[PDB]
RNA sequence: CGUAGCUGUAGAUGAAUGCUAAUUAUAGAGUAU
RNA sequence: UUUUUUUUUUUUUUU
RNA sequence: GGAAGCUGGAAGACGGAAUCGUUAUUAAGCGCCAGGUAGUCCUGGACACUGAAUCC
């Protein structure tokens, strides 16, 4: 904790690292400025422009 | 220039009993008009059973362990009685059916001693029809809000962009 | 003697059946993918029967000056015959046609 | 014309002579490989899939016949024909 | 001459890791998850357990287990006929590289998390 | 790609991808 | 891009590619050995 | 380029 | 209907005779796609590289 490592501590007991989280932000992120189409098991036919 | 579907070439579910479609000696329809649906004939029945109990040591093994088993194997019998028809027991009884009116095609049939069955049971099945009409004012409002539909928001719309607001 | 006026068509039972299908299609477009949709989450495979006949493979290429049902492109929509007329009749000059070139 | 047909298959019926062997080594090639390829049911593929339980070199030449190495060259072809 | 990428050595069908250094096509990655079952139906927590069988080293090598490796390879290099020119395949180890990270399973090579990547 | 000129193209294709077919017959 | 150049194998008497218990893809449907 | 590279070529374009 | 794995002892080294024609980036080989409004050909259309000889 000390002063500055504080919340770093704090992270690592509820399982944080220093790899998997950092990607989470970046998805995040990503997912709200683009579509949330993920290859879903039904999404096909929405892209499928209509004749 | 093929055929367009593949499952016309195959036999279909089973009518237990066995009736030849074209008939020889059947009489002329009445009635079954203005409905114009499942017409009312009658023909010539042939029931037939399988009671695998008289065949052999050899072929009895095999029969039942495709019979009797967790999923069905070929059919769960087996081929043209080339030589099984010594055991098959059937006994012909005059029968009757439906067929469509446009359509021309067999529903099913019915045994004889069944169909007097029918008869003797009127006074139990015709009461059987009033309790049906009890529930049928209970599940008319029910099934009558089965539409699901989007939320209007126009509410016979306002030209909102800056004013009008003290309108409003 | 007098080349047809090719603004109109003349009559033909088997061109209008054409036309006939793609409305069918187009209103019953929706309820095709809401068929695929619940076979697809499901994860079993079945056959669609009502799509035999508002199905949108029905539907073939047409002659509009005409009647035939071969030998027509997407981009001139006439057979043999129907662009040769029209060529010969001085309308294509306006949208960049030049028959000097092979 | 028509006697060839009966003629060649008495050709068939000697391979089920040749037959009751773990399998026959002798062959025309140097190869121990293509050899082995010899016999019925065995290919290009299937000839490769053998050599390799017997961690030797692909063109490697056939040893002496030994008592013990036909055991192993024979556990390893039904293996291999299994698929 | 007849060397496999071609000009530019391309190399459409290999996946990079960040964590150590071993890569494998494809091909390998259907048996690899299958064959680590068990750590991923722990790690979550009949009808679930449905691939049980599959699991078997020995099985995969037989006939039975050889069909059912290519049924779930639909060979994405191959296509249709009119798929020429600009309409080219690509790699496709985008949704391979999704799959193989969400599922968390372990590298042959070191025990650890999702770390694989395009490449 | 019934012959052997276009059947064959499809192998060599899949050979500069990143693929190894095993060419041989056909 | 293909026959490349270059360079390993058997300086093929034995390279013919059709037959099929069996899967890959499009399509609403192309199935049974 | 003596701390430089580590290599075959296409059917529209540097207006 | 198209392609692929495995398996492989389908019928062919016959004839130097004869009939279809090429005015040289011709002839002979090899490789690619554009349209045919899901897939769906060894033909037709269309581009590019190696590219010899004769008395025509």
Redesign the pocket.
């Known amino acids: 904790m000390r002063r500055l490592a504080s919340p770093s501590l704090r992270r690592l007991q509820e399982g944080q690292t220093p790899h998997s989280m950092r990607k989470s932000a970046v998805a995040d992120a990503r997912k709200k400025i683009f579509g949330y189409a993920c290859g879903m098991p039904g999404e096909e036919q929405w892209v499928r422009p209509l ?1 | 220039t ?1 055929g ?4 016309l ?2 036999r279909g579910r089973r009518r237990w009993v066995h009736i030849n479609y074209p008939p020889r000696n059947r009489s002329t329809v009445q009635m079954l008009d203005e409905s114009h649906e499942k017409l009312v004939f009658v023909c010539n029945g042939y029931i037939d059973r399988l009671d695998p109990r008289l065949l052999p040591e050899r072929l009895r093994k095999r029969l039942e362990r495709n019979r009797k088993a967790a999923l069905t194997r070929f059919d769960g019998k087996l081929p043209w009685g080339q030589a099984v028809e010594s055991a098959i027991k059937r006994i012909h009884t005059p029968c009757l059916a439906f067929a469509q009116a446009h359509s021309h095609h067999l529903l099913e049939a019915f045994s004889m001693a069944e169909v007097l069955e029918i008869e003797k049971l009127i006074p139990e099945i015709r009461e059987a029809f009033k309790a049906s009409k009890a529930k049928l004012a209970e599940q008319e409002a029910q099934d009558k809000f089965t539409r699901h539909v989007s939320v209007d928001l126009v509410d016979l719309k306002e030209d909102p962009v800056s004013f009008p607001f003290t309108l409003k | 003697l007098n080349p047809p006026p090719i603004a109109f068509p003349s009559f033909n039972r088997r061109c209008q059946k054409d036309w006939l299908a ?1 409305r069918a299609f187009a209103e019953n477009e929706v309820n ?1 993918r809401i ?2 949709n619940v076979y697809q989450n499901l994860g079993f ?5 009502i ?2 006949k508002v ?7 047409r002659c509009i000056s005409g009647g035939y049902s071969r030998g ?4 001139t929509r006439m057979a043999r015959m129907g662009m040769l007329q029209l060529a010969r009749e001085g309308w294509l000059k306006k949208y960049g046609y030049r028959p000097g070139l ?1 | 014309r028509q006697a ?2 009966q003629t ?1 298959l008495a ?2 019926n ?2 089920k002579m040749k037959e009751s062997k773990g399998l026959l080594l002798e ?5 121990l490989c ?2 082995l ?11 490769l ?1 053998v050599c390799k339980h017997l961690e030797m070199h ?2 490697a030449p056939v040893p002496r016949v030994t008592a013990g190495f036909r055991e192993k060259v024979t556990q390893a072809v039904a293996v291999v024909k299994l ?1 | ?3 496999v990428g ?5 190399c459409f069908l290999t996946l990079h890791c960040s964590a150590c250094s071993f890569f494998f096509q494809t091909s390998d990655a259907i048996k690899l998850i299958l064959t680590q079952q068990h750590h991923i139906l722990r790690k979550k927590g009949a009808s679930k357990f449905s691939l049980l069988p599959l699991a078997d080293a020995s099985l995969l090598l037989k ?1 039975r287990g ?3 490796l ?7 290099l ?11 395949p690509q790699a496709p180890t985008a949704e391979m590289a999704k799959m193989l990270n969400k599922s968390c399973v372990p590298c042959p090579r070191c025990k650890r998390e999702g770390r694989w990547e395009e490449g | ?13 899949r ?2 991808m990143g693929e190894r ?6």
Request: net charge positive; aromatic share 10%; hydrophobic share 30%.
């Open positions: 004749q | 093929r367009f579907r593949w499952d070439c195959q | 793609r095709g068929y695929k495979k079945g056959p669609i029967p799509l035999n199905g949108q493979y029905r539907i073939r290429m027509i492109f997407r981009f092979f | 060839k047909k060649k050709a068939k000697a391979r062959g025309k090639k140097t190869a293509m050899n390829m010899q016999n019925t049911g065995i290919a290009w593929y299937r000839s899939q692909r063109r698929g | 001459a007849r060397r071609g000009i530019g050595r391309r006939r050889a069909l059912v290519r049924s779930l390879h639909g060979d994405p191959v296509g249709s006929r009119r798929q020429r020119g600009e309409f080219a | 790609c019934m012959n052997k000129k276009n059947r064959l193209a499809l192998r060599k294709r050979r500069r077919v095993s060419l041989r017959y056909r």
